[PDB]
Structure 1
Amino acid sequence: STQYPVVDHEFDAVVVGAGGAGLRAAFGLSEAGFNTACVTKLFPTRSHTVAAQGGINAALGNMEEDNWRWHFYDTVKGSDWLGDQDAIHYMTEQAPASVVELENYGMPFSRTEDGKIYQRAFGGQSLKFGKGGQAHRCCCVADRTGHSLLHTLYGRSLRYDTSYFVEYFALDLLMENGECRGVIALCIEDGSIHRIRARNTVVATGGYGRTYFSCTSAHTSTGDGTAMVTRAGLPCQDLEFVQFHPTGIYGAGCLITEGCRGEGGILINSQGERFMERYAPVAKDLASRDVVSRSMTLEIREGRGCGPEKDHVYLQLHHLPPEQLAVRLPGISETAMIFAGVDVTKEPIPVLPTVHYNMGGIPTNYKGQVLRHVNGQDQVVPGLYACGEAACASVHGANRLGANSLLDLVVFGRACALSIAESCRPGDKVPSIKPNAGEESVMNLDKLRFANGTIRTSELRLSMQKSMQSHAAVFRVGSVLQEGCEKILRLYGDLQHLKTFDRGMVWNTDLVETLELQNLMLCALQTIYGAEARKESRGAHAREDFKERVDEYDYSKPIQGQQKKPFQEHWRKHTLSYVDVKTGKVSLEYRPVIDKTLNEADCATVPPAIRSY
Structure 2
Amino acid sequence: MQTFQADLAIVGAGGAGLRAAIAAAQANPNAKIALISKVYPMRSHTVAAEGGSAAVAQDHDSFEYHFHDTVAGGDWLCEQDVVDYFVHHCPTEMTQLELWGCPWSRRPDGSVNVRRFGGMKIERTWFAADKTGFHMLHTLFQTSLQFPQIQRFDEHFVLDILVDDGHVRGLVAMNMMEGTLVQIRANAVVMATGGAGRVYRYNTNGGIVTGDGMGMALSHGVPLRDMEFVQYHPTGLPGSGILMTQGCRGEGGILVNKNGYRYLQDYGMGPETPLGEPKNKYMELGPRDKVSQAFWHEWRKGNTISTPRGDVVYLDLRHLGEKKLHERLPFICELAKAYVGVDPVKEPIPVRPTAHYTMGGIETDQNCETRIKGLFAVGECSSVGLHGANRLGSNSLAELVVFGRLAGEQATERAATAGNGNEAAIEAQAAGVEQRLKDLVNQDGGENWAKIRDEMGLAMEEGCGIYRTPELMQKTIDKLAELQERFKRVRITDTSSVFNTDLLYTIELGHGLNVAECMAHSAMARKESRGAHQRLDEGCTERDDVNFLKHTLAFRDADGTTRLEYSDVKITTLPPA
Q: Shorter-chain-normalised TM-score: which range? A: over 0.9
- How far apart are the structure 1 equivalents of 2:504 and 2:331? 31
Q: Deviations over 1:367-423 (max 9, x none)?
A: 2111x4xxxxxxxx3101111100001211111111111111111101101223455
Q: 2:555 aligns with which of 566, 578, 582?
A: 578
Q: How does 1:256-405 map to 2 (within 5 A)?
A: 256-279=244-267, 280-281=269-270, 282-308=281-307, 311-325=311-325, 329-370=329-370, 372=371, 381-405=372-396
Distance 2:109 2:200 in 1: 45
Q: What is the match of residue 483 of structure 1?
A: 475
Letter in 2 for 1:499: R
1:322 and 1:438 map into 2 onto residues whose CA distance is 61
Preserved CA contact (<8 Å) 1:451 1:498:
yes
- Note the C-alpha offset of 1:24: 0.5
Report the counterpart of residue 599 of structure 1 in structure 2. Answer: none
Task: Please name the residue that 1:132 is paired with.
Answer: none
**Equivalent residues of 1:360, 1:394 under 8 A apart:** no
**Letter of the structure 1 residue corresponding to residue 383 of structure 2:** C
- Return 180-189 or 281-290, whichever deviates more: 281-290
**1:482: how far off?**
1.0
SS in 1 for 2:344: coil
User: Structure 1 residue 548 and structure 2 residue 542: aligned?
Assistant: yes
Q: What is the rounded CA distance, in whole Å, between the counterparts of 2:326 and 2:132 in structure 1?
A: 15
Tell me whether 1:225 sits opposite 2:202 in the alignment.
no
Aligned amino acid, residue 531 of structure 2: G
Instruction: For residue 373 of structure 2, give the secondary structure of its aligned residue in structure 1.
Output: strand
Gaps of 5+ in 2: 271-280
Distance in 2 separating the partners of 1:304 and 1:25: 48
- Specify the SS of the correspondent of 1:136: coil
TM-score (norm 2): 0.93
CA contact (8 A) 2:374 2:414 kept: no
Report whether the alignment pairs 1:406 with 2:397: yes
* Counterparts in 2 of 1:496 and 1:477: CA distance versus 1, 3 Å: same
Identity over aligned residues, as a percent? 41
- Distance, in Å, in 1 between the alignment partners of 2:368 and 2:339 is 38
| Separation in 2, partners of 1:442, 1:287 | 51
Aligned partner of residue 3 in structure 2, secondary structure: strand
Aligned match for 2:409, one of 414, 418, 423: 418
Mapped to 1, the partners of 2:345 and 2:65 lie a distance apart of 34
Residues 416 and 323 of structure 1, relative CA distance in 2, 3 Å threshold: farther
Given that residues 314 and 349 in structure 1 are in contact (C-alpha distance below 8 angstroms), is that contact kept between their aligned partners in structure 2? yes
- Following superposition, the deviation at residue 316 of structure 1 comes to 2.8
Rounded to whole Å, the distance in 1 between the matches of 2:332 and 2:432 is 45
1:141 aligns with 2:138: no
Residues 518 and 257 (structure 1), Cα distance of their counterparts in 2 relative to 1, 3 Å cut: same
Please report how far the alpha carbon of residue 74 of structure 1 lies from its aligned counterpart in structure 2 after TM superposition: 0.5
For 2:451 and 2:38, locate their aligned partners in 1 and report how far apart those are by CA, in whole Å.
23
Q: Is the 8 A contact 2:234 2:288 kept in 1?
A: yes
- Three-state SS of the structure 1 residue aligned to 2:235 is coil
Encode CA deviations 1:279-330: one digit per residue, 9 max, x unaligned: 2234432233222211112212211113436811112333235444467532
Does the 8 Å CA contact 1:366/1:393 hold for their aligned counterparts? yes
Aligned position for 2:11: 16
Query: 1:530 aligned to 473, 497, 522, which one?
Result: 522
Q: CA deviation at 1:80?
A: 0.6
Deviations 1:346-375 (A, max 9, x none): 3322111111100000011222111x4xxx
Does the CA-based 8 Å contact 1:12-1:430 persist in structure 2? no
| 1:470 Cα offset (Å) | 1.3
For 1:286 and 1:91, how far apart are their aligned partners in 2? 25
Measure, in 2, the Cα distance between the counterparts of 1:430 and 1:157.
Answer: 29
Cα distance change, pair 425–322 in 1 and its aligned pair in 2 (3 A) = farther
Matches of 1:238 and 1:328, distance apart in 2: 39
Instruction: Kindly indicate which of the two structures has a greater share of residues assigned to helix.
Output: 2
Change in 2 beyond 3 A, CA 1:584/1:487: same
Deviation at 1:431, TM superposition (A): 4.6
1:595 equivalent to 2:571? Answer yes
Any conservation in 2 of the 1:206–1:389 contact (CA below 8 Å)? yes
Do 2:187 and 2:414's aligned partners in 1 also have CA atoms closer than 8 Å? no
Report what 1:35 is aligned to: 32
Counterpart in the other structure of 1:606: 574
Please, which moves more after superposition, 469-478 or 536-545? 469-478
Q: What is the deviation of 1:441? A: 2.0
Partners of 1:59 and 1:328 in 2: CA distance:
26
Secondary structure, counterpart of 1:366 in structure 2: coil
Deviations 1:202-249 (A, max 9, x none): 000001111111111111111100001000111111111111110110
C-alpha separation between the residues in 1 aligned to 2:565 and 2:36? 32
Change (3 A) 1:80 1:509: same
For residue 235 of structure 1, what is the amino acid of its counterpart? P
Q: Secondary structure at the match of 1:332?
A: helix
Report the AA paired with residue 547 of structure 1.
T
Is 1:68 equivalent to 2:44 in the alignment?
A: no
Q: TM-score scaled by structure 1?
A: 0.88
CA contact (8 A) 2:8 2:415 kept: no
The C-alpha deviation readout for 1:530-573, integer Å capped at 9, x for no partner, is: 11111000000001111011112xxxxxxxxxxxxxxxxx0111
Specify whether residues 503 and 104 from structure 1 end up closer, same or farther in structure 2 by C-alpha distance, changes over 3 A only. Answer: same
Q: CA deviation at 1:197?
A: 1.3
Report the equivalent of 2:502: 510
Q: For this pair of structures, how many residues does the alignment match?
A: 558
Cα drift, residue 424 of structure 1: 5.9
Cα 1:317–1:394, aligned 2, differ >3 Å: closer, same or farther?
farther
Among 177, 185, 189, the alignment partner of 1:201 is 189
Contact 1:460-1:491 within 8 A present in 2 as well: yes
Matched to 1:37, the amino acid is A
Structure 1 stretches of 5 or more lacking a match?
Answer: 1-5, 127-134, 373-380, 553-569, 597-604
SS in 1 for 2:374: strand
In 2, the alpha carbon distance for the partners of 1:67 and 1:149 equals 24
Which residue matches 2:164? 176
**Which residue pairs with 1:95 in the alignment?**
90
Q: Is the 8 A contact 2:374 2:415 kept in 1?
A: no
| C-alpha separation in 1, matches of 2:119 and 2:170 | 40
